Design an enzyme around this catalytic site. Sequence first.
Site, short mmCIF file in Angstrom:
data_model
loop_
_atom_site.label_atom_id
_atom_site.label_comp_id
_atom_site.label_asym_id
_atom_site.label_seq_id
_atom_site.Cartn_x
_atom_site.Cartn_y
_atom_site.Cartn_z
N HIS A 1 16.14 -31.64 -7.47
CA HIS A 1 16.55 -32.69 -6.51
C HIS A 1 15.90 -34.02 -6.80
O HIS A 1 16.37 -35.03 -6.23
CB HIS A 1 16.51 -32.39 -4.98
CG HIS A 1 15.06 -32.25 -4.50
ND1 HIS A 1 14.40 -31.02 -4.60
CD2 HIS A 1 14.18 -33.18 -4.12
CE1 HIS A 1 13.03 -31.20 -4.26
NE2 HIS A 1 12.89 -32.54 -3.95
N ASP B 1 15.71 -24.76 -8.01
CA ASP B 1 15.27 -26.16 -7.94
C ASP B 1 14.20 -26.51 -8.97
O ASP B 1 12.96 -26.60 -8.71
CB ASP B 1 14.88 -26.49 -6.49
CG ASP B 1 14.59 -27.97 -6.35
OD1 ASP B 1 15.25 -28.78 -7.05
OD2 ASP B 1 14.13 -28.36 -5.24
N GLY C 1 7.53 -37.55 -1.21
CA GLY C 1 6.94 -38.20 -2.39
C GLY C 1 6.39 -37.15 -3.35
O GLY C 1 5.76 -37.51 -4.40
N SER D 1 7.58 -33.95 -4.18
CA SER D 1 8.54 -33.10 -4.91
C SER D 1 8.43 -33.21 -6.43
O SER D 1 7.98 -34.28 -6.90
CB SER D 1 9.97 -33.52 -4.61
OG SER D 1 10.50 -32.66 -3.62
N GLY D 2 8.71 -32.13 -7.14
CA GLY D 2 8.60 -32.09 -8.61
C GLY D 2 7.21 -31.78 -9.11
O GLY D 2 7.08 -31.33 -10.27
#
Lengths: 58, 223
Positions: free
Chosen positions: B40, B84, B175, B177-178
Amino acid sequence: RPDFCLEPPYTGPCRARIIRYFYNAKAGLCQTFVYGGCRAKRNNFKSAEDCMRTCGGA
Amino acid sequence: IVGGYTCGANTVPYQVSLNSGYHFCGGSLINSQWVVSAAHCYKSGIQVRLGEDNINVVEGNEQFISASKSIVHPSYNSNTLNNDIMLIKLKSAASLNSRVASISLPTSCASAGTQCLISGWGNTKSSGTSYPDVLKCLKAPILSDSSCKSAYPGQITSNMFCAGYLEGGKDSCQGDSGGPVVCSGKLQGIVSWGSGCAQKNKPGVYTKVCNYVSWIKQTIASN
Ligand SMILES: [Ca+2]
Protein backbone atom coordinates in the site's frame (compact mmCIF):
# COMPACT_ATOMS: atom_id res chain seq x y z
CA ARG A 1 -21.39 18.98 -6.33
CA PRO A 2 -22.19 15.48 -4.79
CA ASP A 3 -22.97 13.90 -1.44
CA PHE A 4 -19.78 11.89 -0.90
CA CYS A 5 -18.36 15.34 -1.12
CA LEU A 6 -19.87 16.21 2.21
CA GLU A 7 -18.54 13.17 4.01
CA PRO A 8 -15.57 13.63 6.31
CA PRO A 9 -12.05 12.54 5.32
CA TYR A 10 -11.26 8.83 5.93
CA THR A 11 -7.64 7.96 6.83
CA GLY A 12 -8.44 4.30 7.34
CA PRO A 13 -6.39 1.51 8.96
CA CYS A 14 -3.22 1.51 6.85
CA ARG A 15 -0.19 3.33 8.26
CA ALA A 16 1.11 5.20 5.24
CA ARG A 17 1.39 8.94 5.42
CA ILE A 18 0.07 10.13 2.10
CA ILE A 19 -1.22 13.67 1.64
CA ARG A 20 -4.51 13.76 -0.24
CA TYR A 21 -7.46 16.06 -0.77
CA PHE A 22 -11.03 16.18 0.35
CA TYR A 23 -13.92 18.48 -0.13
CA ASN A 24 -14.42 20.48 3.10
CA ALA A 25 -17.86 21.96 2.77
CA LYS A 26 -17.55 23.94 5.94
CA ALA A 27 -14.66 25.75 4.33
CA GLY A 28 -16.06 25.84 0.83
CA LEU A 29 -12.85 24.49 -0.51
CA CYS A 30 -10.71 21.42 -1.02
CA GLN A 31 -8.28 20.61 1.78
CA THR A 32 -5.44 18.28 2.50
CA PHE A 33 -5.60 15.28 4.96
CA VAL A 34 -3.49 12.24 5.85
CA TYR A 35 -4.48 9.14 3.94
CA GLY A 36 -3.15 5.87 5.42
CA GLY A 37 -2.87 4.02 2.09
CA CYS A 38 -5.91 1.82 1.85
CA ARG A 39 -9.68 1.56 1.71
CA ALA A 40 -10.14 5.13 0.52
CA LYS A 41 -13.60 6.64 0.33
CA ARG A 42 -14.75 8.94 -2.42
CA ASN A 43 -13.86 12.29 -0.83
CA ASN A 44 -10.22 11.46 -1.44
CA PHE A 45 -8.57 13.19 -4.39
CA LYS A 46 -4.93 13.18 -5.54
CA SER A 47 -4.89 16.77 -6.43
CA ALA A 48 -6.82 19.94 -5.56
CA GLU A 49 -7.72 20.37 -9.22
CA ASP A 50 -9.49 17.00 -9.36
CA CYS A 51 -11.18 17.70 -6.10
CA MET A 52 -12.42 21.04 -7.22
CA ARG A 53 -13.70 19.42 -10.44
CA THR A 54 -15.67 16.60 -8.88
CA CYS A 55 -16.71 18.21 -5.66
CA GLY A 56 -16.20 22.03 -6.04
CA GLY A 57 -19.31 23.94 -5.06
CA ALA A 58 -20.98 21.27 -2.94
CA ILE B 1 6.18 5.57 30.11
CA VAL B 2 5.94 6.49 26.43
CA GLY B 3 6.08 3.73 23.81
CA GLY B 4 8.56 4.99 21.22
CA TYR B 5 12.07 6.32 21.91
CA THR B 6 14.62 8.19 19.77
CA CYS B 7 16.58 5.23 18.41
CA GLY B 8 19.79 7.18 18.00
CA ALA B 9 21.34 8.31 14.70
CA ASN B 10 22.06 5.59 12.19
CA THR B 11 21.46 2.91 14.80
CA VAL B 12 18.93 1.28 12.56
CA PRO B 13 21.06 1.25 9.44
CA TYR B 14 18.60 -0.71 7.27
CA GLN B 15 15.73 1.75 7.67
CA VAL B 16 14.74 3.68 4.65
CA SER B 17 12.58 6.60 4.05
CA LEU B 18 10.32 6.42 0.98
CA ASN B 19 9.87 9.99 -0.36
CA SER B 20 7.72 11.57 -3.00
CA GLY B 21 8.07 15.19 -2.05
CA TYR B 22 7.75 14.16 1.66
CA HIS B 23 8.13 11.01 3.70
CA PHE B 24 5.19 8.80 3.05
CA CYS B 25 6.35 5.36 4.25
CA GLY B 26 9.29 3.36 5.48
CA GLY B 27 11.08 0.27 4.17
CA SER B 28 14.08 -2.07 4.84
CA LEU B 29 17.27 -2.48 2.81
CA ILE B 30 17.68 -6.22 2.14
CA ASN B 31 20.68 -5.82 -0.16
CA SER B 32 22.43 -2.91 -1.94
CA GLN B 33 19.80 -2.50 -4.72
CA TRP B 34 16.62 -3.85 -3.13
CA VAL B 35 14.09 -2.48 -0.62
CA VAL B 36 11.17 -4.33 0.91
CA SER B 37 8.07 -2.28 1.76
CA ALA B 38 4.31 -2.45 1.99
CA ALA B 39 2.23 -2.89 -1.08
CA HIS B 40 0.00 0.00 0.00
CA CYS B 41 3.07 2.20 -0.20
CA TYR B 42 3.17 1.75 -3.91
CA LYS B 43 3.50 5.14 -5.62
CA SER B 44 4.93 6.46 -8.82
CA GLY B 45 7.88 8.76 -8.38
CA ILE B 46 9.60 7.36 -5.25
CA GLN B 47 13.03 8.41 -4.09
CA VAL B 48 14.42 6.13 -1.46
CA ARG B 49 16.40 7.87 1.30
CA LEU B 50 19.08 5.90 3.13
CA GLY B 51 21.26 6.77 6.14
CA GLU B 52 18.72 9.17 7.55
CA ASP B 53 18.13 10.28 11.04
CA ASN B 54 16.63 13.66 10.70
CA ILE B 55 14.56 13.49 7.56
CA ASN B 56 14.48 17.22 7.47
CA VAL B 57 18.09 18.06 7.63
CA VAL B 58 21.01 16.91 5.52
CA GLU B 59 23.21 15.50 8.13
CA GLY B 60 25.73 14.08 5.70
CA ASN B 61 25.06 10.37 5.87
CA GLU B 62 22.40 10.28 3.21
CA GLN B 63 22.10 8.56 -0.13
CA PHE B 64 18.96 9.58 -2.00
CA ILE B 65 18.43 7.02 -4.79
CA SER B 66 15.44 6.85 -7.01
CA ALA B 67 13.79 3.54 -7.75
CA SER B 68 13.89 1.93 -11.21
CA LYS B 69 11.16 -0.64 -10.51
CA SER B 70 8.52 -1.32 -7.85
CA ILE B 71 7.06 -4.80 -7.64
CA VAL B 72 3.87 -5.28 -5.69
CA HIS B 73 3.01 -8.79 -4.74
CA PRO B 74 1.03 -10.50 -7.48
CA SER B 75 -1.67 -11.35 -4.98
CA TYR B 76 -1.86 -8.13 -3.02
CA ASN B 77 -5.54 -7.54 -2.07
CA SER B 78 -6.42 -3.83 -1.69
CA ASN B 79 -9.49 -4.74 0.31
CA THR B 80 -8.41 -7.56 2.60
CA LEU B 81 -4.84 -6.21 2.79
CA ASN B 82 -3.58 -9.68 2.22
CA ASN B 83 -0.03 -10.08 0.86
CA ASP B 84 0.88 -6.52 1.72
CA ILE B 85 4.44 -6.68 0.38
CA MET B 86 6.33 -4.79 -2.37
CA LEU B 87 9.92 -4.80 -3.59
CA ILE B 88 11.70 -1.81 -4.77
CA LYS B 89 14.72 -1.77 -7.01
CA LEU B 90 17.09 1.16 -6.71
CA LYS B 91 18.29 2.95 -9.92
CA SER B 92 21.78 2.36 -8.63
CA ALA B 93 23.27 0.34 -5.85
CA ALA B 94 23.68 1.85 -2.43
CA SER B 95 27.13 2.29 -0.89
CA LEU B 96 26.96 0.14 2.16
CA ASN B 97 28.83 1.07 5.28
CA SER B 98 28.12 1.28 9.01
CA ARG B 99 25.40 3.88 8.84
CA VAL B 100 23.98 2.13 5.75
CA ALA B 101 23.40 -1.54 5.98
CA SER B 102 21.04 -4.30 5.05
CA ILE B 103 18.88 -6.72 7.19
CA SER B 104 18.84 -10.50 6.76
CA LEU B 105 15.69 -12.29 5.72
CA PRO B 106 14.29 -14.80 8.22
CA THR B 107 15.25 -18.45 7.93
CA SER B 108 12.26 -19.20 10.09
CA CYS B 109 9.26 -17.53 11.56
CA ALA B 110 9.21 -16.01 14.97
CA SER B 111 6.97 -17.41 17.70
CA ALA B 112 4.54 -15.40 19.94
CA GLY B 113 6.48 -13.77 22.68
CA THR B 114 9.51 -12.87 20.61
CA GLN B 115 10.40 -9.23 21.30
CA CYS B 116 11.03 -7.08 18.19
CA LEU B 117 12.17 -3.56 17.12
CA ILE B 118 9.76 -1.44 15.13
CA SER B 119 11.24 1.76 13.69
CA GLY B 120 9.87 4.60 11.66
CA TRP B 121 9.17 8.28 11.40
CA GLY B 122 5.39 7.94 11.83
CA ASN B 123 2.99 9.91 14.08
CA THR B 124 4.08 9.77 17.73
CA LYS B 125 0.61 10.64 19.28
CA SER B 126 -2.07 7.95 19.83
CA SER B 127 -4.66 10.58 19.35
CA GLY B 128 -3.13 13.73 18.17
CA THR B 129 -0.55 14.64 15.58
CA SER B 130 3.18 14.86 15.79
CA TYR B 131 5.62 13.60 13.17
CA PRO B 132 9.19 13.39 14.43
CA ASP B 133 12.34 14.67 12.70
CA VAL B 134 14.57 11.85 13.85
CA LEU B 135 14.00 8.08 13.81
CA LYS B 136 11.85 6.56 16.60
CA CYS B 137 12.05 2.93 17.85
CA LEU B 138 9.73 0.62 19.82
CA LYS B 139 10.32 -2.84 21.23
CA ALA B 140 7.08 -4.85 21.08
CA PRO B 141 6.52 -8.62 21.46
CA ILE B 142 4.98 -10.79 18.86
CA LEU B 143 1.34 -11.65 19.60
CA SER B 144 -0.23 -15.02 19.40
CA ASP B 145 -2.40 -15.76 16.46
CA SER B 146 -5.26 -16.62 18.67
CA SER B 147 -5.19 -13.30 20.40
CA CYS B 148 -4.57 -11.48 17.16
CA LYS B 149 -7.66 -13.03 15.69
CA SER B 150 -9.72 -12.02 18.70
CA ALA B 151 -8.50 -8.47 18.30
CA TYR B 152 -9.55 -8.49 14.60
CA PRO B 153 -12.19 -11.08 14.06
CA GLY B 154 -12.52 -12.32 10.48
CA GLN B 155 -9.73 -10.08 9.16
CA ILE B 156 -6.40 -11.68 9.98
CA THR B 157 -4.91 -13.98 7.30
CA SER B 158 -2.09 -16.49 7.54
CA ASN B 159 0.12 -13.80 6.15
CA MET B 160 -0.44 -11.45 9.06
CA PHE B 161 0.82 -11.05 12.62
CA CYS B 162 -0.10 -8.74 15.55
CA ALA B 163 2.49 -7.26 17.67
CA GLY B 164 2.39 -4.79 20.48
CA TYR B 165 0.56 -4.43 23.82
CA LEU B 166 -3.15 -5.15 24.49
CA GLU B 167 -2.97 -2.20 26.92
CA GLY B 168 -2.27 0.23 24.05
CA GLY B 169 -0.09 3.37 24.34
CA LYS B 170 2.82 1.87 22.44
CA ASP B 171 2.23 1.25 18.70
CA SER B 172 3.21 2.20 15.19
CA CYS B 173 1.10 4.60 13.27
CA GLN B 174 0.58 6.67 10.07
CA GLY B 175 3.97 7.28 8.43
CA ASP B 176 5.24 3.91 9.64
CA SER B 177 4.03 1.56 6.95
CA GLY B 178 6.60 -0.43 4.92
CA GLY B 179 9.17 -0.17 7.83
CA PRO B 180 10.72 -3.11 9.62
CA VAL B 181 9.87 -5.42 12.44
CA VAL B 182 13.24 -6.93 13.20
CA CYS B 183 13.50 -9.85 15.56
CA SER B 184 16.77 -11.33 16.73
CA GLY B 185 18.51 -9.92 13.75
CA LYS B 186 16.17 -11.08 11.10
CA LEU B 187 13.44 -9.19 9.25
CA GLN B 188 10.08 -10.60 10.38
CA GLY B 189 7.46 -8.08 9.64
CA ILE B 190 6.34 -5.10 7.67
CA VAL B 191 4.33 -2.34 9.39
CA SER B 192 0.98 -2.55 7.73
CA TRP B 193 -2.30 -1.67 9.57
CA GLY B 194 -4.41 -1.36 12.72
CA SER B 195 -7.54 0.30 14.22
CA GLY B 196 -6.31 3.78 14.98
CA CYS B 197 -2.96 3.70 16.67
CA ALA B 198 -1.99 2.57 20.16
CA GLN B 199 -5.51 1.58 21.19
CA LYS B 200 -6.46 -0.92 23.91
CA ASN B 201 -7.16 -4.34 22.49
CA LYS B 202 -6.14 -3.25 18.99
CA PRO B 203 -2.54 -4.14 18.46
CA GLY B 204 -0.73 -3.36 15.23
CA VAL B 205 -0.94 -5.72 12.25
CA TYR B 206 2.15 -6.75 10.27
CA THR B 207 2.93 -8.80 7.04
CA LYS B 208 4.47 -12.13 8.06
CA VAL B 209 7.78 -11.82 6.17
CA CYS B 210 8.90 -15.44 6.67
CA ASN B 211 6.06 -16.44 4.32
CA TYR B 212 7.63 -14.64 1.31
CA VAL B 213 11.26 -15.39 1.59
CA SER B 214 11.14 -17.61 -1.46
CA TRP B 215 9.20 -15.10 -3.45
CA ILE B 216 11.56 -12.30 -2.59
CA LYS B 217 14.80 -14.21 -3.25
CA GLN B 218 13.62 -15.33 -6.56
CA THR B 219 11.96 -11.99 -7.59
CA ILE B 220 15.11 -10.17 -6.72
CA ALA B 221 17.10 -12.75 -8.72
CA SER B 222 15.26 -12.30 -11.89
CA ASN B 223 14.62 -8.56 -12.10
CA1 LIG C 1 19.12 13.37 7.31
